[PDB]
């Protein structure tokens, strides 16, 4: 939860600043998978590259409340990720088989979610996760459809 990113090639500041430019267009409209992957790759690399928690900083923590809450959020996210069904060709992030339904989720809710809001016009994360979990069963998605099998045959 505390790290000294000295050996890495790109600190948190550089990741955020250099990604903001494409994040503008990401906030504007639906982008392609290549766009999103290019926009998130350095952040994913940085958060897959820390060596260990820096003890010199960690052992001085007096109030563990913020650290424990952050760790709990990370653990909940990891638990949810472990059960997500993801497209095989994208390993940096998880593309679920849940089709984007524009009528149900107009783009303003998505933009507000990307902005970090939680008001009544924001995308409802719990409901979306419920829909994705229900639709992403292994018995509904792992077997390729009849069209692909016919095309192979």
């Amino acid at each position: 939860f505390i790290f000294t990113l000295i050996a890495v090639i790109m600190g948190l500041i550089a990741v955020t600043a250099t990604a903001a430019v494409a994040g503008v267009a990401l906030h504007s409209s639906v982008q392609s998978v290549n766009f999103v992957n290019d926009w998130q790759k350095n952040s994913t690399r940085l958060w897959n590259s820390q060596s260990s928690i820096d003890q010199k900083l960690a052992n001085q923590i007096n109030d563990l409340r913020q650290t424990v809450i952050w760790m709990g959020d990370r653990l909940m996210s990891l638990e949810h990720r472990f059960q997500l069904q993801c497209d095989w060709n994208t390993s940096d992030f998880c593309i679920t088989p849940q089709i984007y339904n524009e009528s149900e989720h107009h783009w303003d809710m998505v933009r507000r979610h990307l902005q970090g809001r939680e008001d009544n016009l924001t995308l409802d994360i719990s409901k979306l996760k419920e829909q994705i979990f229900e639709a992403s069963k292994a018995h509904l998605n792992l077997v390729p459809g009849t069209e692909a099998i016919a095309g192979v045959a």
Partner: protein
């Protein structure tokens, strides 16, 4: 064709504002002689990345933590911590050791003789700030920071951005005029000002207070601000923001005394403080926490934070310019976003492998 699917980005390059509903974060100062822990004397891991420009446009659920002179941000001002050692001499009352540091400015009562706006709400547990002077003041040179609960809290912000109060004490010079006549002044005096931290750093500084009434210091306690929000939500104390504000300027170390003489056959009390010592400090947050420095604009009607050409930093030092504001931020948690592909979602490349094998035949 085009197929859009929901995707989860676990580590997005986004940031979110640290709010008053967050629990206190770690701010590391590089000088343990004058500032309590946590301590880190290292430079930023990526010094070349400090100061990179960025446009910010985010929302929030709870009032963000911002420091500076702007709506929604806590204004800074000098706070003075005074240690007074009683002296047995008949012509001297005390010997003084003062530390002046940039910290959180309390709101003032313009009508009530320019005092501090004060709130009695939600008094926290803790040792009350001392009202007397300990006779045995050992280790005088070494400053010891003890957290204490003031008699009343000072209000730092009471507007539509929220109500922020601080139960840490604020020290000032004053006169005890309970039994005196109306000629006894009731206005508190600050021994140091903002310029004392900035202008003519290497030049001798002196402060002289003179009155026919004894000079008292209150409220006492070597205790740093612990602001919290009480409206429209109730959040935990944040005793780490003063650490960010205190590194923005040199701290000034004063030594002094209060002496007594005779004037018009009456006791005359003079507080003399002098300083030729300033200490520069560096306060840093560490990943996943950062600071957004610049023209932070907080609009509470839509709960929006915007800034054009802000800078991303992790450390604050004495070259900080208080024309800019500081917004505490943290790396954003995973997000959900629609993404468009040119093919249907696939669980595994098994069909692709079979097709390649068949084509090879």
């Amino acid at each position: 064709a085009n197929y859009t699917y929901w995707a989860y980005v676990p580590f997005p390059p986004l940031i979110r504002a640290v709010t008053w509903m967050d629990n206190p974060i770690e701010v590391y100062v590089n000088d343990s002689v004058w500032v309590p822990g946590p301590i880190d004397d290292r430079c930023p891991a990526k010094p070349e990345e400090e100061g990179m420009m960025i446009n910010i446009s985010i929302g929030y659920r709870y009032p963000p933590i911002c420091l500076g002179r702007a709506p929604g941000c806590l204004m800074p001002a000098v706070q003075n911590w005074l240690v007074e050692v009683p002296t047995v001499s008949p012509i001297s009352r005390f010997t003084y050791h003062m530390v002046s540091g940039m910290s959180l400015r309390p709101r003032v009562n313009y009508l009530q003789d320019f005092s501090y706006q004060r709130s009695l709400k939600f008094r926290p547990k803790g040792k009350p700030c001392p009202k007397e002077i300990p006779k045995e003041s050992k280790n005088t040179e070494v400053l010891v920071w003890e957290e204490c609960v003031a008699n009343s809290a000072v209000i730092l912000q009471n507007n539509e951005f929220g109500t922020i109060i601080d139960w840490a004490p604020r020290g000032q010079f004053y006169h005890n005029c309970s039994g005196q006549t109306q000629s006894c002044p009731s206005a508190q005096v600050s021994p140091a000002v903002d310029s004392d931290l900035t202008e003519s750093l290497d030049k001798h500084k002196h402060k002289k207070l003179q009155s026919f009434y004894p000079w008292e210091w209150g409220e006492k306690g070597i205790s740093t601000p612990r602001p919290k929000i009480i409206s429209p939500v109730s959040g935990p104390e944040h005793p780490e923001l003063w650490r960010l504000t205190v590194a923005s300027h040199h701290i000034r170390i004063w030594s002094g005394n209060q002496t007594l003489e005779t004037r018009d056959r009456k006791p005359f009390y003079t507080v003399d403080l002098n300083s030729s010592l300033t200490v520069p400090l560096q306060s840093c947050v560490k990943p996943p926490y950062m600071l957004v420095v610049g023209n932070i604009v907080i609009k509470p009607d839509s709960q929006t934070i915007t800034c054009e050409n802000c800078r991303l930093l992790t450390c604050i030092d004495s070259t900080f310019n208080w024309q800019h504001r500081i917004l505490l931020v943290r790396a954003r948690e995973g997000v959900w976003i629609p993404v468009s592909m040119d093919r249907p979602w696939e669980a595994s490349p098994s069909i692709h492998i079979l097709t390649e094998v068949l084509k090879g035949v």
